[PDB]
Amino acid sequence: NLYYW
Amino acid sequence: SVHVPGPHAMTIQELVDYVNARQKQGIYEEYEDIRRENPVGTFHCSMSPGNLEKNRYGDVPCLDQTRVKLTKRQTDYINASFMDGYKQKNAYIGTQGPLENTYRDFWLMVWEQKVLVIVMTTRFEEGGRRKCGQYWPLEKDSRIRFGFLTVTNLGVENMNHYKKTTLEIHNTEERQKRQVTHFQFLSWPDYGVPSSAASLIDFLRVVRNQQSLAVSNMEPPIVVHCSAGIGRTGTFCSLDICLAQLEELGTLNVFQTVSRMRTQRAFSIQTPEQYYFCYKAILEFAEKEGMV
């Protein structure tokens, strides 16, 4: 999503 | 279960004094201490070729040691972790928001693990970007076939902060059917907290009551997911565990609950705001219940 943080 | 009272359980009054002594920043620093523990476990399956594309996020793998394996398979992998609850082994399965290429893995897991209730704490899109795929039939008489599992929507009820959908899962190979209840909570953004502690706590009782009802009509885990399945998921489950211990024994320990949870669904609770929210929600509940 591509990175959550 | 890893979630047992010992050895530093606090009463509700001790909790009040504790939070008062530490204040918000003390609580935020407590979250940082949690974050700093080195994870107990490994993430090899999550990072294997073939499985990489089954993760929604490059930075949210899942633990080898507690993952839910798929048996009737093209790998046994789904980004999903068994999680203990209060005095209950495998009370939850914590998992990411399903991707188009994992919809069928998701339903296989739900079938295989005899799941009766799904809890979704995300919208499909929040702040522009994709957060979760539309993995279930949205409208009443719609169906979707995921291989030998056909899922049919039997009805949708809209509530203030969540929607309740009744689904039938029909395993057309075995010729068996099961009803599953799907709850979507709409007012809890990624990286954030719910607009109201009270609405989330009401939501929790609804979920609890449905799980108890379903079980009596037959303990299976409740599937709990968000986008990554760690932030809101960890917060939801941690609050559930704390409130359960509070109800039964009049004690709880947030730090212990979260620390333990992170050994099962790695990275549970994603911000200090979420961690602080756990304490605040419990205290607000206590006050509204007259333990104030």
A2 to chain B: which residues are within 8 Å by CB? 57-58
Q: Say if residue B231 carries a ligand binding annotation.
A: yes
Joined tokens for residue B263 = 């050994």
Contact B58 A5 (CB under 8 A): no
- Resolution of the experimentally solved model in angstroms: 1.9
Q: Structural domain boundaries of chain B?
A: 1-292
Joined tokens for residue B258 = 């979260």
Give B207's contacts (C-beta < 8 A, 6+ positions apart). Answer: B117, B119, B183, B222
Method: X-ray
User: How far apart, in whole angstroms, are the C-alpha atoms of residue B226 and residue B265?
Assistant: 13
Of B129, B230, B270, the CB nearest to A1: B129
Candidates 3.40.30.10, 3.90.190.10, 3.40.190.10, 3.40.640.10; CATH matching B1-292: 3.90.190.10
- Positive or negative, the CA dihedral B58, B62, B64, B70 is negative
Sheet holding B176-185, edge to edge: B80-85, B88-95, B222-225, B117-120, B176-185, B162-171, B149-158, B143-146
The H-or-E segment that residue B89 falls in is strand B88-95
User: How far apart, in whole angstroms, are the C-alpha atoms of residue B230 and residue B237?
Assistant: 10
Strands B80-85 and B162-171: unpaired
- The CA angle B133-B99-B211, to the nearest 5 degrees, is 70
Give B264's contacts (C-beta < 8 A, 6+ positions apart). Answer: B2, B63, B66, B81, B82, B83, B84, B94
Q: Residues B226, B237, B242, B278: which is the catalytic one?
A: B226
Contact A1 B59 (CB under 8 A): no
- Residue B185's beta-bridge partner residues? B162
- Residue B150's beta-bridge partner residues? B145, B170
User: How far apart, in whole angstroms, are the C-alpha atoms of residue B52 and residue B227?
Assistant: 16
Q: How many Å is the Cα radius of gyration of chain B?
A: 19
User: How far apart, in whole angstroms, are the C-alpha atoms of residue B117 and residue B218?
Assistant: 13
Tell me how close the Cα of A5 comes to any Cα of chain B, in angstroms: 8
